[PDB]
A = this chain, B = another copy of it.
């Protein structure tokens, strides 16, 4: 039976399947007391162009078109009025500095990630100072459907 860690990392990878930016298919699942409260994948602002259709918007070696997966989970909370305080997050890719700041500021207490994607040393510095646990964990092998 899938452990909680495997259960949520698998969910993060499934969530990434709708990513519309082929630089990285990113999925995030926000969890409170082992319950899923929000999810997100990387894509353009809702009702705007996606990279799949009009191409990336590159600036300083990053695609700036997308709302990031982690940010989409947090913004789901802000839009609906759901508390993200005292949560943990499972993400397919290590959070960029912008996502890191938002997550820490929102009260996210633990970050579990699969891919060591472009790890920013300042993101590590912030997680360390804020005493937020970060953990690498592989997505388990799971087959769904017939």
Contact = CB atoms under 8 A, between A and B. Distances in A.
Nearest to A76: B35
Given A7-B18, A10-B14, A72-B105, A139 B146 contact: yes
A74 B80 contact: no
Interface residues of A, number: 66
Contacts of A101: 45, 66-67, 71
Q: How many copies does the complex hold?
A: 6
A14 B17 contact: no
Interface of A: 1-2, 7, 10-11, 13-15, 17-20, 32, 35-39, 45-49, 52, 57, 59-60, 64-67, 71-72, 74-85, 97-98, 101-102, 104-107, 122, 126, 129-130, 138-146
